[PDB]
């Protein structure tokens, strides 16, 4: 019988009986099943995230290179004061970086530091920004919002550093 649906590989086929392709996982090659799992996992998680909303319809107010930039681009560009980034929108991307981070990886970084090393305090701050963001991200954003310019810029700078550290090695 047939090849993997391809509407199924991405989630669930919605074409009903008309579809000639295979919806039967038993007859699927391993790769297909691996791909499906990835798409399905990305959805499950997205469905638990509290939307920071339909603010794409607000491309009327003209700030639209936030996609090409990405969260990191936007953060890097808020820091070196380029490309016009609103504090408010950089608080938003900040929340998106902290969702992307794992506290446990940071805890591991904290071990490799000497006692009384000033980094332990930064790691610990970063950690409870991660912990706070997991629960209430409006408030965390509205906290980051009420944080002085140069404090915010600094916070983010170490968050990006850690973010980079963890992945490349």
């Amino acid at each position: 019988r047939r090849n993997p649906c391809k509407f199924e590989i991405r989630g669930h086929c919605l074409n009903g009986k008309r579809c000639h392709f295979s919806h039967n996982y038993f007859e699927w090659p391993p790769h297909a099943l691996l791909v499906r799992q990835n798409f399905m996992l990305n959805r499950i998680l997205k469905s638990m995230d509290k939307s920071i909303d339909e603010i794409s319809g607000a491309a009327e107010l003209d700030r639209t290179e936030e996609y090409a930039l990405g969260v990191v681009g936007v953060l890097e560009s808020y820091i070196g004061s380029i490309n016009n980034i609103t504090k408010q929108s950089a608080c938003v991307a900040m929340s998106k970086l902290l969702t992307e981070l794992n506290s446990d990886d940071i805890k591991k970084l904290r071990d490799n530091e000497e006692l009384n090393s000033p980094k332990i305090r930064v790691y610990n701050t970063v950690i409870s920004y991660i912990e706070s963001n997991r629960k209430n991200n409006k408030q965390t954003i509205h906290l980051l919002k009420r944080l002085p310019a140069d404090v915010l810029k600094k916070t983010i700078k170490n968050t990006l550093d850690i973010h980079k550290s963890i992945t490349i090695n």
């Binding site: 305090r121 930064v122 701050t125 409870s128 920004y129 706070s132 408030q139 965390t140 906290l143 009420r146 944080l147 002085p148 404090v151 600094k154 916070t155 170490n158």
Partner: peptide, 13 residues
């Protein structure tokens, strides 16, 4: 509260 974190940040950066 979030209060304790505001202080913590400011003090550390």
């Amino acid at each position: 509260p979030f209060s304790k974190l505001y202080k913590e940040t400011i003090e550390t950066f």
